[PDB]
Write a protein that binds this ligand. Structure first.
Ligand SMILES: [Cu+]
Ligand SMILES: [Cu+]
Ligand SMILES: [Zn+2]
Ligand SMILES: [Zn+2]
Lengths: 151, 151
């Protein structure tokens, strides 16, 4: 697939639509999320496209290379580590990410996995506690969706 | 990927959870759907895992081999043609299908595509008209979900 899409939903007001496109040798991620508190929010690809228990069943961050959590610019990071999206005072975060580890086909494919946006900022694996090395202390999952093949 | 899952949701009362497991050259489909009118309902994999416009954005039945619509036992069928599920008096349909044409990997993989349950029975392409060999005359889309990788 060369295009994918994800519709985020949760128990609260946060929602959004995320688009993915394979361009060149990389993946361009665009879209928007609304209903967020002003500021930074962790944003990652989780391993399972399973919404049977809400966002909890998506599992941990997608991590096929078995590394510790980091920011998108770090060598030591999970494949799903897309950092933070930033919401303005109106609650809107415009997503604009280009990422070198995710893909839409093959081993690194995120098709069928889940995008999650979190309650708190991702500390990029630099918080200094064990949780930082797993999730960046991004906290609860406000909304998520399964990543599907788009036309 | 040897397991997948799909949670069906719509704008009405129908909902359900569908599980998929690869066994040999088949996929075993299980689960249940509730809130249905008693009787048969068409059940297919549609091409796109795009929920930006409810179930309409899922597109047509998944058909990489460019064939006409048929029942799951027919040679001439769409890869996404899984026939009918049957709801009891209480509106519950227990899913139990073993299919040789859908897959969870490779080009006829359904991961990242959409499962749809319909308003009417699928006539298995034997309705006697042209709509029969496109959709089985199964009617409107009551609920759908994107098919994701499961643990
Ligand atoms: Cu996350
Ligand atoms: Cu269908
Ligand atoms: Zn991570
Ligand atoms: Zn069909």
């Amino acid at each position: 697939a060369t295009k994918a899409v994800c519709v985020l939903k949760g128990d609260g007001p946060v929602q959004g639509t995320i688009h993915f496109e394979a361009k060149g040798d990389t993946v361009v991620v665009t879209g928007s999320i609304t209903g967020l508190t002003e500021g930074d929010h962790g944003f990652h690809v989780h391993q399972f496209g399973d919404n049977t228990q809400g966002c909890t069943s998506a599992g941990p961050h997608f991590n096929p290379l078995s590394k510790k959590h980091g920011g998108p610019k770090d060598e030591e990071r999970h494949v799903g580590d897309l950092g933070n999206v930033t919401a303005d005072k109106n609650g809107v975060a415009i997503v604009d990410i280009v990422d070198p580890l995710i893909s839409l086909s093959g081993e690194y494919s995120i098709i069928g996995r889940t995008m999650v946006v979190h309650e708190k900022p991702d500390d990029l694996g630099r918080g200094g506690n064990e949780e930082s090395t797993k999730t960046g202390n991004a906290g609860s999952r406000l909304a998520c969706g399964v990543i599907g093949i788009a036309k």
